[PDB]
Design an enzyme around this catalytic site. Sequence first.
Site, PDB file in Angstrom:
ATOM      1  N   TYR A 144       6.894 -40.715   4.289  1.00 55.29           N
ATOM      2  CA  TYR A 144       5.578 -40.736   3.197  1.00 55.29           C
ATOM      3  C   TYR A 144       4.680 -40.156   3.570  1.00 55.29           C
ATOM      4  CZ  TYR A 144       0.649 -41.613   5.197  1.00 55.29           C
ATOM      5  OH  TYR A 144      -0.794 -40.980   5.674  1.00 55.29           O
TER       6      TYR A 144
ATOM      7  N   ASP B 179      11.743 -45.959 -14.668  1.00 59.12           N
ATOM      8  CA  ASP B 179      10.396 -46.179 -14.807  1.00 59.12           C
ATOM      9  C   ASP B 179       9.600 -45.583 -14.006  1.00 59.12           C
ATOM     10  OD1 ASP B 179       8.956 -48.992 -14.189  1.00 59.12           O
ATOM     11  OD2 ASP B 179       9.586 -49.403 -11.411  1.00 59.12           O
TER      12      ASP B 179
ATOM     13  N   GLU C  89       2.279 -46.014 -10.560  1.00 60.16           N
ATOM     14  CA  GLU C  89       2.839 -47.177  -9.810  1.00 60.16           C
ATOM     15  C   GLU C  89       3.820 -46.002  -8.590  1.00 60.16           C
ATOM     16  OE1 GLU C  89       3.905 -51.044 -10.336  1.00 60.16           O
ATOM     17  OE2 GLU C  89       1.913 -51.036 -11.701  1.00 60.16           O
TER      18      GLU C  89
HETATM   19  N1  LIG Z   1       6.692 -43.427   0.952  1.00 57.91           N
HETATM   20  C1  LIG Z   1       5.616 -43.763   0.618  1.00 57.91           C
HETATM   21  N2  LIG Z   1       3.876 -43.711   0.686  1.00 57.91           N
HETATM   22  C2  LIG Z   1       3.473 -43.943   0.908  1.00 57.91           C
HETATM   23  N3  LIG Z   1       2.562 -45.270  -0.279  1.00 57.91           N
HETATM   24  C3  LIG Z   1       3.478 -45.844  -0.405  1.00 57.91           C
HETATM   25  C4  LIG Z   1       5.437 -45.342  -0.673  1.00 57.91           C
HETATM   26  N4  LIG Z   1       5.811 -45.821  -0.558  1.00 57.91           N
HETATM   27  C5  LIG Z   1       5.447 -47.228  -1.675  1.00 57.91           C
HETATM   28  N5  LIG Z   1       4.130 -46.959  -1.260  1.00 57.91           N
HETATM   29  C6  LIG Z   1       2.880 -47.924  -2.663  1.00 57.91           C
HETATM   30  O1  LIG Z   1       3.761 -49.308  -2.258  1.00 57.91           O
HETATM   31  C7  LIG Z   1       3.929 -49.331  -3.520  1.00 57.91           C
HETATM   32  C8  LIG Z   1       5.311 -49.801  -4.140  1.00 57.91           C
HETATM   33  O2  LIG Z   1       6.268 -49.179  -3.469  1.00 57.91           O
HETATM   34  P1  LIG Z   1       7.150 -49.505  -4.460  1.00 57.91           P
HETATM   35  O3  LIG Z   1       8.577 -49.172  -3.762  1.00 57.91           O
HETATM   36  O4  LIG Z   1       7.223 -48.989  -5.446  1.00 57.91           O
HETATM   37  O5  LIG Z   1       7.653 -51.197  -4.551  1.00 57.91           O
HETATM   38  P2  LIG Z   1       8.350 -51.556  -5.393  1.00 57.91           P
HETATM   39  O6  LIG Z   1      10.110 -51.283  -5.383  1.00 57.91           O
HETATM   40  O7  LIG Z   1       8.730 -52.544  -4.836  1.00 57.91           O
HETATM   41  O8  LIG Z   1       7.790 -51.942  -7.031  1.00 57.91           O
HETATM   42  C9  LIG Z   1       3.479 -48.062  -4.404  1.00 57.91           C
HETATM   43  O9  LIG Z   1       3.260 -48.668  -5.052  1.00 57.91           O
HETATM   44  C10 LIG Z   1       2.600 -47.508  -3.194  1.00 57.91           C
HETATM   45  O10 LIG Z   1       0.922 -47.402  -3.690  1.00 57.91           O
HETATM   46 CA   LIG Z   2      11.008 -51.291  -7.534  1.00 60.09          CA
HETATM   47 CA   LIG Z   3       7.365 -49.975  -8.028  1.00 60.42          CA
END
Ligand SMILES: Nc1ncnc2c1ncn2[C@@H]1O[C@H](COP(=O)(O)OP(=O)(O)O)[C@@H](O)[C@H]1O
Ligand SMILES: [Ca+2]
Ligand SMILES: [Ca+2]
EC number: 2.7.11.1
Length: 263
Positions: A87, A131, A135
């Site tokens: 987290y 990537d 984000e």
């Molecule tokens: N470990 C984490 N702790 C806090 N926020 C997270 C974490 N992982 C992802 N997020 C939030 O969730 C969003 C999407 O997660 P991610 O795994 O990058 O998405 P996807 O794989 O669907 O593109 C991130 O851009 C961020 O805002």
């Molecule tokens: Ca992804």
């Molecule tokens: Ca992402």
Amino acid sequence: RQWALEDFEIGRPLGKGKFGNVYLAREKQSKFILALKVLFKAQLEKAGMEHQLRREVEIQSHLRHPNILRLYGYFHDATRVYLILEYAPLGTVYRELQKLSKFDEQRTATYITELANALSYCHSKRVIHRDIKPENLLLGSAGELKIADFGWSVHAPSSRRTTLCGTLDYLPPEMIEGRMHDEKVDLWSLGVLCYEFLVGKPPFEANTYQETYKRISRVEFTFPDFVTEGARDLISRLLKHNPSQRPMLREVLEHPWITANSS
Ligand SMILES: Nc1ncnc2c1ncn2[C@@H]1O[C@H](COP(=O)(O)OP(=O)(O)O)[C@@H](O)[C@H]1O
Ligand SMILES: [Ca+2]
Ligand SMILES: [Ca+2]
């Protein structure tokens, strides 16, 4: 080995991606606070990206670096897949960028340093992220940057790109042109982020895919007056059309402007 949904109290939504829906969660037995990335099998399969998921788990589970987000494990249940992630309490660089519009030179140089170190460890195993964008950049409790989301991760060299859409903003010419690519893709991204951090927007932003494609392929970008010479120098060196002309990461970490500003 070997979790199940029942092992976790789920908290508030942390973020949504294209496929990932991410929640704060606590492990009941230990009270360990973490993040669960939830994916829908249906959506992944139908269509496209089930192989990226496997790639993301396989590659990221095995990486151990303070500037790379941990994947602790996973499980599933017929409708969904659950990635158990470290987290990141200070959110994304994206949201921070929204908050203050643009970063100072000290903050930018530190982010780039933290990024260059994570990437140099990744590249040491010929793993390329592909990537890297705000984000996917999370912030730890000390405010330290953490590269996340390894769905697009692969070993180098690679081909194809597969097919991606969403923005082209952070992709080098050899990736938008479907060509074979290196660890050098990640160096281009580094240059794009460096410019976005100081300027507040990506060097090649445009209103359409077709124009953006054109700006990237022609590598047409200009600096606002406020961008200093040492930042101009670093970014111009990262945003070269020819991949091999791009610096090694060591050159980036030892760049005077980086060493001058990096905290
Ligand atoms: N470990 C984490 N702790 C806090 N926020 C997270 C974490 N992982 C992802 N997020 C939030 O969730 C969003 C999407 O997660 P991610 O795994 O990058 O998405 P996807 O794989 O669907 O593109 C991130 O851009 C961020 O805002
Ligand atoms: Ca992804
Ligand atoms: Ca992402």
